[PDB]
Amino acid sequence: GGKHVLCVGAAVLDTLFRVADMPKGEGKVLPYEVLQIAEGMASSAAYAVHRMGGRASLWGAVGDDETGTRILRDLSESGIDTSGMTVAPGARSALSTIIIDNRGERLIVPFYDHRLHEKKRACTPEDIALFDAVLVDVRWPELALDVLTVARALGKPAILDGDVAPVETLEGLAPAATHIVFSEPAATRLTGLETVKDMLPVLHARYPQTFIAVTAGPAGCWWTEADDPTVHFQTTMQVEAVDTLAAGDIFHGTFALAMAEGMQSRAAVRLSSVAAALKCTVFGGRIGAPTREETEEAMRQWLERE
Amino acid sequence: GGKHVLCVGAAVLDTLFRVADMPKGEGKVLPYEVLQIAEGMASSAAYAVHRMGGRASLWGAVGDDETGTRILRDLSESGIDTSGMTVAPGARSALSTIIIDNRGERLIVPFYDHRLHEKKRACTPEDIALFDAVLVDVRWPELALDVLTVARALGKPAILDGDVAPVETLEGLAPAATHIVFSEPAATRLTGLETVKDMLPVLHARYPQTFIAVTAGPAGCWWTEADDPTVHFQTTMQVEAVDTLAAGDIFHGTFALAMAEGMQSRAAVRLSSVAAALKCTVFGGRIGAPTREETEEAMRQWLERE
Ligand SMILES: [Cl-]
Numbered sequence: 001g002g003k004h005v006l007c008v009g010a011a012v013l014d015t016l017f018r019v020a021d022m023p024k025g026e027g028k029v030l031p032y033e034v035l036q037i038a039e040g041m042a043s044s045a046a047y048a049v050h051r052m053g054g055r056a057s058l059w060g061a062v063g064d065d066e067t068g069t070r071i072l073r074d075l076s077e078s079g080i081d082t083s084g085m086t087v088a089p090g091a092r093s094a095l096s097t098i099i100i101d102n103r104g105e106r107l108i109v110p111f112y113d114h115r116l117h118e119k120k121r122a123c124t125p126e127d128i129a130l131f132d133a134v135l136v137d138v139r140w141p142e143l144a145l146d147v148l149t150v151a152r153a154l155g156k157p158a159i160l161d162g163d164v165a166p167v168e169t170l171e172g173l174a175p176a177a178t179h180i181v182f183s184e185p186a187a188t189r190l191t192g193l194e195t196v197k198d199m200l201p202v203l204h205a206r207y208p209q210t211f212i213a214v215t216a217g218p219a220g221c222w223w224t225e226a227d228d229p230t231v232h233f234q235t236t237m238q239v240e241a242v243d244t245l246a247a248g249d250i251f252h253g254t255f256a257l258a259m260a261e262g263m264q265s266r267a268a269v270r271l272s273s274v275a276a277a278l279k280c281t282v283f284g285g286r287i288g289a290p291t292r293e294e295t296e297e298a299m300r301q302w303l304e305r306e
Numbered sequence: 307g308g309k310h311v312l313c314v315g316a317a318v319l320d321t322l323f324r325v326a327d328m329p330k331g332e333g334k335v336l337p338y339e340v341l342q343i344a345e346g347m348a349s350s351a352a353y354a355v356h357r358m359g360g361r362a363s364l365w366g367a368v369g370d371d372e373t374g375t376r377i378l379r380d381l382s383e384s385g386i387d388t389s390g391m392t393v394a395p396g397a398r399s400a401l402s403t404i405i406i407d408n409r410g411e412r413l414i415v416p417f418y419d420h421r422l423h424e425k426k427r428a429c430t431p432e433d434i435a436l437f438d439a440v441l442v443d444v445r446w447p448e449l450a451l452d453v454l455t456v457a458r459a460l461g462k463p464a465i466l467d468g469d470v471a472p473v474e475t476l477e478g479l480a481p482a483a484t485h486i487v488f489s490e491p492a493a494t495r496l497t498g499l500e501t502v503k504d505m506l507p508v509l510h511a512r513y514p515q516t517f518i519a520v521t522a523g524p525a526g527c528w529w530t531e532a533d534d535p536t537v538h539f540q541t542t543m544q545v546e547a548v549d550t551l552a553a554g555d556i557f558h559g560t561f562a563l564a565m566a567e568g569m570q571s572r573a574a575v576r577l578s579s580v581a582a583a584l585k586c587t588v589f590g591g592r593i594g595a596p597t598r599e600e601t602e603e604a605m606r607q608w609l610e611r612e
Pocket residue numbers: 066067070372373376
């Protein structure tokens with residue numbers, strides 16, 4: 001069972017090369033560990049939904065190529081329903097190299113073909129009525145807009161992962177959502193302010209009927225509820241940040257599932273925070289996404305810390 | 307038709323990311339062109355044999371994985387007989403990221419699983435008698451040793467691509483070959499001398515019954531014939547070096563084919579040099595390997611330069 005969450009957006013073949021020292025120019029660096037993993041904001045959020053006890057579907061695009069075949073196979077073997085994914089004929093599938101040093105710092109070299117997302121993908125109310133919530137990233141904005149709109153019309157949580165994108169893109173999607181979780185950099189760009197707590201008053205005023213959260217990694221999460229300007233704050237669990245790649249995605253997927261489950265806001269922010277924290281302690285992007293059980297137990301112990 | 311050359315060694319899925327500026331630390335660099343190409347020293351040499359009008363077979367290892375499937379498919383679609391390639395069960399196939407800036411300089415992040423080459427691959431005189439020459443790289447030394455030995459026993463050119471490797475490896479393979487083409491760095495390591503022309507006297511004395519060449523890229527090629535210490539030199543064609551990746555491989559494959567064809571040494575060094583030069587003017591590793599016709603015409607014009 002479990003609630004069913006539709007995730008919409010990125011599906012990318014990452015190759016993660018774990019090195020001691022970050023390269024600083026031409027030459028050669030020998031990796032000591034290499035992982036190829038299909039991930040991306042929506043895909044990792046979908047994986048988190050699955051890991052956290054929900055059912056996950058993903059709408060996203062690959063090309064009709066070998067990288068695409070591999071993305072589809074990995075994602076469905078990882079517990080995600082890929083049956084509604086788009087194969088964009090003549091597009092090349094997204095892939096990235098990420099070089100992760102022994103500080104957990106990253107160098108990313110991403111390949112992205114815009115042709116992936118140039119064709120209209122169908123989004124009917126009958127399609128969406130099958131889901132309990134929807135979560136969309138900034139990667140496929142014209143589909144994301146439609147999914148948010150239809151979901152909200154149907155009375156469903158319509159959640160925007162408001163990560164870095166052109167301001168235009170963020171401003172286009174934000175008005176369609178019932179819930180937005182911005183990353184600190186996205187919120188910074190949108191508000192032009194520096195400190196996260198100062199961004200919530202402005203973001204609430206702009207979208208006063210919307211749930212708005214801004215995540216700040218180890219610094220916690222600030223949010224405002226629909227129709228109320230009170231700013232709430234929730235600290236996160238402190239862990240050793242081995243690999244923060246996909247942390248926000250694990251957060252978003254957990255949060256989207258918590259909404260589909262009807263969870264109170266602070267409970268949902270806590271669960272998402274702990275899940276993200278757990279994932280940060282394991283090298284490999286989304287691969288550290290914890291089970292629901294692991295998150296619940298961690299959270300229990302954390303809530304009793306001294 | 308065409309002579310048939312066996313190439314033995316590396317088979318690697320390269321992803322080549324073409325960037326303006328070489329990254330210098332963590333962050334992100336956006337590529338403007340991305341090419342995925344199966345190559346590696348032996349594989350590219352094999353491709354050059356094909357492009358230059360010969361028939362090429364490759365013995366090399368991949369894992370039973372998706373990267374392996376892709377390597378095999380690319381190489382056979384590129385005109386190479388892959389029917390004798392080894393699928394090493396439980397090994398992971400080799401892949402690399404190469405970031406190539408607008409100076410044509412490179413940063414390489416190679417993944418290699420030694421398990422690829424831990425099992426014995428058969429090498430019978432009946433297998434080898436089907437080839438007109440053999441060319442081996444330093445990547446699979448125990449197979450390379452056998453292929454060189456059997457080929458030479460059969461009266462065939464037995465050519466060593468003497469590129470960078472442990473000195474032990476180079477010293478183990480060199481005595482089995484009828485012809486060795488060392489890269490400047492390999493010859494430097496083996497002799498401990500600095501200037502290429504000074505390396506030929508020592509390398510001839512060590513292997514006096516062997517054809518020995520040392521390539522120096524745009525600086526040309528020095529060599530000694532079997533049984534004679536006279537050092538010969540051949541300048542190369544000056545080109546704009548857009549991408550020198552695989553240049554030496556194109557050289558070796560052409561040279562191996564020239565030997566299978568019974569070509570005189572200077573003619574063979576010239577043809578290999580021009581072929582390598584041509585390949586350097588095109589971005590993308592081995593993808594610039596010229597046709598036999600393109601090389602012959604270029605060489606004709608170059609030999610009439612003023
Ligand atoms: Cl692949």
